[PDB]
Chain A
Amino acid sequence: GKAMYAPPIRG
């Protein structure tokens, strides 16, 4: 029951 983080910055 948590929001997902976006992935790390590719760059």
Chain B
Amino acid sequence: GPVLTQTPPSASEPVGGTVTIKCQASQAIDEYLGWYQQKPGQRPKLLMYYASTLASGVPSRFKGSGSGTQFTLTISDLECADAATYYCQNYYVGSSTNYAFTFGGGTEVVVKGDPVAPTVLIFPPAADQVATGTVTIVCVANKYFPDVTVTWEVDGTTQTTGIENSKTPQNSADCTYNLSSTLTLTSTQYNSHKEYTCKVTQGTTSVVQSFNRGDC
């Protein structure tokens, strides 16, 4: 070591709540320990160093603690802006051969905001797709929380292949997601069917958008 391990791998708490992330060093490191925030698609951000010193700019509801082999990052009064992955790190140079810079494995914090049902859009394939031999159908679910399930139906028949799902990170203001779901078929497959359907289910709510090939 020192090898850093983090628990839990994931935490989920409501806005205004508290999250405690644990960092274990496989051997004593005094307080030579930093914490970082990283949101999907962005660079890491220093929150805390020397275990408990707040980096400039960072809100006081972030509290660092610990020593030797155990450390915690405790986030009070959770905001949607706190949705991210958090990493602890060694930061120590004692000599030319005595040093540590490795990170822990990370903890994802999901922040549970107010429930918002999705609206759903479906986009039939642009005219110049079919000639390529394959067609991709885009379905989009807007501004929702909590998570949804997507289902593609072709003439009533549920699809299980050719589907890729992509979700945007929680909105920093209201915790909501956006979802992009695509359905890819060969052109011959696409022209043999009429009704194309995307169903987005959120708990006991479903929102369905369809289109008929021939009308588009």
A residues lining the B interface (CB < 8 Å): 5-11
Contacts and interface: CB of A to CB of B under 8 A. Distances in A.
10 contacts: A5-B95, A6-B92, A7-B94, A9-B28, A9-B29, A9-B30, A10-B28, A10-B30, A11-B28, A11-B30
A5 B93 contact: yes
Interface in B24-63: 28-30, 32
Contacts of A7: 94
A9 B93 CA distance: 10
A1 to B, nearest CB: 17
Interface string B82-107: 00000000001111000000000000
B68 interface: yes
Interface residues of B, number: 9
Contacts of B28: 9-11
Contacts of A8: 94
B27 to A, nearest CB: 8
A10 to B, nearest CB: 5
Contacts of B29: 9
Nearest to B28: A11
Interface of B: 28-30, 32, 68, 92-95
A5 B30 contact: no
Given A8-B94, A9-B29, 7 more contacts: A6-B93, A6-B94, A7-B94, A9-B28, A9-B30, A11-B28, A11-B30
B32 A6 contact: yes
Nearest to B2: A9
A8 B2 CA distance: 14
Contacts of A11: 28, 30, 68
A3 to B, nearest CB: 8
A7 B93 CA distance: 9
Nearest to B69: A11
Nearest to B95: A5
B68 A5 contact: no
A11 B2 CA distance: 13
A5 B29 CA distance: 15
